């Protein structure tokens, strides 16, 4: 899963 490139990065 979670790669962190989306609109909710923070």
């Amino acid at each position, epitope marked *: 899963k*979670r*790669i*962190h*490139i*989306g*609109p*909710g990065r923070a």
Partner: antibody
Amino acid sequence: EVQLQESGPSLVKPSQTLSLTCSVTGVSITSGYWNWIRKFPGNKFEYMGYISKSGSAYYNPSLKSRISFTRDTSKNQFYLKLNSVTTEDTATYYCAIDDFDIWGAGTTVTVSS
Amino acid sequence: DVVMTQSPVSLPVSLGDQASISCRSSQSLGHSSGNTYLHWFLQKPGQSPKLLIYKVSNRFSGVPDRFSGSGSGTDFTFKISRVEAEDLGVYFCFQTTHDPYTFGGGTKLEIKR
């Protein structure tokens, strides 16, 4: 295990408003941020904006006056609304997960009289 | 509005050969590769976009090692060592460093059999 499904009218008259729905399955819409993307004929994508974990909405400047997002936890769906459409709004609309690693099949919309 | 200039538009290649796609941004998308949000997607005929490479060089899960990714500041290259028949489709670069998120024009990859 996540699934995305976009639905709406495949035909709209110029000047009317477009209303799309993105049915999310496999995880509640309140778990993260969701994406709205359109693809005009000729392979040309344009990021439309996003709905936050809290229902907030960011709109691509080229649309924020006609564009509008909303959500509904109970139906586990979030929506897109586009006002005064022109034949230039003709495209396949998509909703994808936060990190863009899962999109819906997309729904094609034709703006024509 | 970060402008993503993708070339070539059409890439004819023979099976087993090396394929290269280039993408250039009008703005710096970061300075580290772990801060540079430039990604590569592939769109097969009649399907949704599939994320193949994120953060310039990070290969997503389930993506073969034939797919490579590298870049710097504004220059990014996507490579496919041994082109196979299932690689057929259109490749897109896309950035999420700045709002609004913008895409490259796309590159249509075709096989020379």
